Enzyme design. Structure first.
Site, PDB file in Angstrom:
ATOM      1  CG  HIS A 287      56.486  -2.461  15.484  1.00  0.00           C
ATOM      2  ND1 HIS A 287      56.980  -1.185  15.318  1.00  0.00           N
ATOM      3  CD2 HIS A 287      57.560  -3.252  15.726  1.00  0.00           C
ATOM      4  CE1 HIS A 287      58.297  -1.208  15.425  1.00  0.00           C
ATOM      5  NE2 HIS A 287      58.673  -2.451  15.666  1.00  0.00           N
ATOM      6  CD  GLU A 288      57.292  -7.210  16.912  1.00  0.00           C
ATOM      7  OE1 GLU A 288      57.607  -6.251  17.638  1.00  0.00           O
ATOM      8  OE2 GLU A 288      58.112  -7.803  16.179  1.00  0.00           O
ATOM      9  CG  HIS A 291      59.981  -5.830  12.536  1.00  0.00           C
ATOM     10  ND1 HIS A 291      60.840  -5.035  11.810  1.00  0.00           N
ATOM     11  CD2 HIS A 291      60.049  -5.390  13.817  1.00  0.00           C
ATOM     12  CE1 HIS A 291      61.392  -4.140  12.613  1.00  0.00           C
ATOM     13  NE2 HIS A 291      60.938  -4.341  13.837  1.00  0.00           N
ATOM     14  CG  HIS A 297      63.470  -0.578  14.117  1.00  0.00           C
ATOM     15  ND1 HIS A 297      64.320  -1.289  14.937  1.00  0.00           N
ATOM     16  CD2 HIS A 297      62.213  -0.899  14.505  1.00  0.00           C
ATOM     17  CE1 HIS A 297      63.608  -2.002  15.791  1.00  0.00           C
ATOM     18  NE2 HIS A 297      62.326  -1.781  15.552  1.00  0.00           N
TER      19      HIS A 297
HETATM   20 ZN   LIG Z   1      60.701  -3.347  15.849  1.00  0.00          ZN
END
Ligand SMILES: [Zn+2]
Length: 336
Positions: A287-288, A291, A297
């Site tokens: 997830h990171e 990003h 999101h």
């Molecule tokens: Zn996030």
């Protein structure tokens, strides 16, 4: 007969000898348990490299439909697969002493429990089974969440993902490796990105530690510690994670500088973040990393990039997949 792994007795040497036999062309392996049989086609991950303090870790995956992955180092091996939406890991360390330490580490929070955590024996402890989804229910662990901050080349570009064990933290090789694998898998599952990047994860220790439980302040200090580190000069264009076992305050699982890595302009340690590595929250580093590579999101609760922790490991947003692939040097004309 087709090779098989018996989940009632799976050991390090079972997994090591099966996986060390996987050639470039893959190998069928049957996962067997009571009431359970899954034939998986295992291939070596030739795209990802991992060293944990210079110890080489190799990754394997079933087919997408197999929902199965493996990890193999000299000291430990992991089989993880999904059954009825739940993530089940069989974790096996080679040395008896470390295997006992690992089993006690996983048993401790629990002091129907065998459905969440079970020591596996062949007398002699050979592995532990963790169903993190059942384990989180039994331990009533919170939902947790995120909230973060602001031409096919001839050969794939090598990008180092430099992971730094936070000073004073203890992390376990099976747990860190699992996070790196899901992070690597999450990128390669997008727009055939193995043609563009080969991710090389390394784990070292850093002197830095977060001065508080605030993830924002921690990341500020981490990114600053990278700039001030002479060892790191000349490597300001790679990707960096501070890792720990635990979380941050407010059930924050990790944090990173949004849209901070691009293959053409990476610099100044901008592509930096922090991640928990504990087993019960798979996919946080994925997830990171999304990003960092520009993903925002997503609305779909089944997306890796959903705002709350979902347990899903893959990008589903076409917009995020575009942004990630673009930052890795792909374009729409390249196809998948
Ligand atoms: Zn996030």
């Amino acid at each position: 007969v087709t090779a098989s792994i018996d989940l009632q007795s799976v050991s390090y040497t079972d997994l090591a000898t099966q996986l060390n036999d996987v050639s470039d062309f893959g190998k069928m392996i049957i996962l067997k348990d009571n009431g359970f049989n899954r034939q998986v086609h295992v291939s070596m991950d030739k795209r990802t490299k991992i060293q944990l303090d210079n110890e080489n870790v190799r990754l394997f995956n079933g087919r997408d439909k197999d929902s199965t992955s493996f990890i193999l180092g000299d000291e430990f091996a992991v089989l993880r697969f999904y059954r009825n939406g739940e993530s089940i890991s069989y974790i096996a360390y080679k040395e008896a002493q470390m295997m006992n330490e690992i089993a006690e580490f996983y048993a401790a929070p629990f002091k129907n429990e065998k459905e969440a955590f079970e020591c596996i024996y062949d007398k002699d402890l050979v592995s532990v089974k963790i169903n993190i989804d059942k384990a989180k229910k039994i331990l009533n662990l919170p939902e947790c969440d995120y909230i973060i901050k602001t031409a096919v080349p001839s050969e794939p570009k090598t990008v180092y993902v430099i992971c730094l064990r936070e000073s004073g933290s203890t992390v376990y090789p099976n747990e860190v490796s699992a996070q790196m694998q899901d992070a690597a898998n999450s990128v390669y599952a997008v727009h055939g990105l193995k043609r563009f990047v080969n991710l090389h994860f390394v784990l070292y220790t850093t002197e830095y530690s977060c001065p508080s439980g605030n993830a924002d302040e921690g990341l500020d200090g981490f990114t600053a510690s990278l700039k001030a580190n002479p060892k790191a000069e000349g490597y300001d264009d790679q990707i960096y994670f501070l890792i720990r076992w635990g979380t941050w305050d407010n059930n924050i699982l990790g944090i990173s500088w949004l849209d901070s890595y691009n293959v053409n302009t990476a610099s100044d340690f901008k592509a930096s973040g922090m991640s928990t590595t504990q087993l019960m929250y798979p996919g946080v580093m994925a997830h990171e990393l999304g990003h960092i590579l520009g993903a925002r999101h997503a609305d779909d609760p089944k997306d890796l990039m959903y705002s709350k922790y979902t347990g899903y490991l893959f990008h589903l947003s076409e917009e995020n997949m575009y942004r990630i692939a673009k930052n890795l040097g792909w374009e729409i004309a390249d196809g998948d």
